[PDB]
């Protein structure tokens, strides 16, 4: 972590000196600040303000998850370190990536759901659908490590469980048919526009094609594919 | 709707003092109100606003709607309770009422299908346009749509000109009721329908009564009440 | 365009009396200007801005890019025919079409892209998705005389080209499977609402991809492709 920051200091801070009609916010986004918690809620209270919710607010609210909880920043740094990976730059990433801070703001949102701050839990969890078009319901257990490619236009229901290093294309849905939603193994790669239904589980390795509707259950390391999707 | 708006003040009235910051806002939209018109169109005048529109604009507008048609209030609470009744995530009154884009999308449409009969249709596109940018939701103010329908996960449904979605009929995400140029070109969809999510109906067809339509399914044909609908091309099953 | 504006001003002119609620909105817009580039510069200045970016500098920024390239004022002028052809009455198209507003924002960014401006195209790319729902990478060569049909989640990659006189529908993906690796898409094709392809692969001229087809193979001109896994017709 401490290095993926030093690398976004000097990243944002030629887009800085290149681009004076980005150098404020970027400034104050980043390059005020000292640590990645802090610039990650700086800049996730200004996207996701309202009227109900300020931006101060959120700020506030996001600076104390992510300090009150190692495993936040663990995840926030290992869904960055999966795109420049797998997909940009680190800070493009950072302010840019719909996918990577809405997958960030759920947990947030997860840990609210579990500290049973629920009607505020689903009142950010609106605004990750309206601004970042991602639409995680916060009781849904996410890995670290996952790649949202274009986040537009996912769903995942409430009772889906995501593991480690997946990665969701656009146009995702993980949704039912009580644990109705299905469980994705660790390094999943799910095709764009596939739909993904009912309390089934997704093999470790495996791989689903795009436009692809999986009923059935997909056993580690295998590809399926299709409309109904079958074992390739 | 007595007892429905009830519910909702009261479970407005829990949240508010197990969440501060939810507070004020949820006193202004549903507490300090007396009815249920009055707080729809309260908060949809601020969900629903921008630099063209006001929200005191547009509060006025849904409210003068409401209250000339007592047919979008009965809508409305059919549309609440068709959430409580069925919706996989199970909501509560309120919650629907202010963080569900579906049943939100469904109520400023309403009032939009009326500004088009009322031959204010500047104005009907002006506010469809505001509905597609918040909720995600992109139906023609011509399309006629019944009442007690549910929209799960609204973000990415569309809806044509000429289409007819009857009462009682659950539309999914990402589905598209749309064309195949003039004339009735858009599907009917009867009563009791269930749309999954992702599916596309295509051209002036009939899914007819109690009949299911899967997800990611492509379909170009009539459906007979009472039967399921799959795959792409779509069959009957 | 001497004209398409001239039918613009007519139609907003008869907007503005018949909804006092659009009236002002319609006179900043359109009737206050004796343009059609200065119009949607100051339009997609107000659909676009945010607190990183002001309207007013934005209107700046496409107010200099539509004066010193005649081929984006051409460019609108197609898109806009296109629109009140194969769909609007031309003033609605300029002010509420997604699909449109997108086009003639993206280009903008494209140039800036070519101009070495990448920084700020990829944050007016990053506005485009957000307001129009129009994902397309501003690397990304798209022709003129385009139409999106409600154009929500369309998602064009880095190496895809679109040729003139396209019809892209609702949910369109041109997407891939570094290097040349998105589609190519041919003049006068018509792509169904729902459809994904993907790969450096062809779809010829005069050719149509049916809805909720997934494309992996190239597609001749003047065929039908439809299905998944598509086949042709
Ligand atoms: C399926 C995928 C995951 C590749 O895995 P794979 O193991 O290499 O699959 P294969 O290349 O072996 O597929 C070969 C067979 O599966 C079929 N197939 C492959 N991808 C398919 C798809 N997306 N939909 C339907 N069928 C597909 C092929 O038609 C072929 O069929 P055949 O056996 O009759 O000849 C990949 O092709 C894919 O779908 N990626 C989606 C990524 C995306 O959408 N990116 C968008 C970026 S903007
Ligand atoms: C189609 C649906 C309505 C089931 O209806 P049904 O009458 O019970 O049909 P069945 O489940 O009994 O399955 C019947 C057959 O159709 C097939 N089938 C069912 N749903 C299918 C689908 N979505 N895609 C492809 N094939 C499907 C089944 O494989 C089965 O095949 P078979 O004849 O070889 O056995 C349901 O599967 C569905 O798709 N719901 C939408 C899910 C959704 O949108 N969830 C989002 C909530 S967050
Ligand atoms: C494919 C399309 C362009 C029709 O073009 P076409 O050249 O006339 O093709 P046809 O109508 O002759 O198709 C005939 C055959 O292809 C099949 N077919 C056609 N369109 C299909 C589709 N979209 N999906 C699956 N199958 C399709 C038909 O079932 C029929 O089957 P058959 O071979 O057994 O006879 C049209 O179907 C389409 O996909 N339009 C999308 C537009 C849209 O989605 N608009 C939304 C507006 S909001």
Redo the contacts between chains.
Sequence with gaps: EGWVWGQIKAEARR?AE??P??AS?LYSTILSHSSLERSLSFHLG?KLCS???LST?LYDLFLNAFSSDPSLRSAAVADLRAARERDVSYS?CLL?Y?GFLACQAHRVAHLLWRQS?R??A??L??RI???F?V?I?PAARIGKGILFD?A??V?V??TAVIGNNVSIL??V?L??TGD?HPKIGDGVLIG??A?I?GNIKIGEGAKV???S?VLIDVPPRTTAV???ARLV
Excluded: F
């Design positions: 887009d290149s681009e009609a980005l916010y200004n009227s109900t919710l607010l493009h840019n719909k701050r009607p505020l689903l009142a969890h609106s659908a309206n601004v078009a639409d319901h274009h537009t236009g769903v229901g409430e656009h146009h849905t949704g039912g109705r764009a526009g739909t239904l094609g795009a436009g509707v299709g409309n109904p």
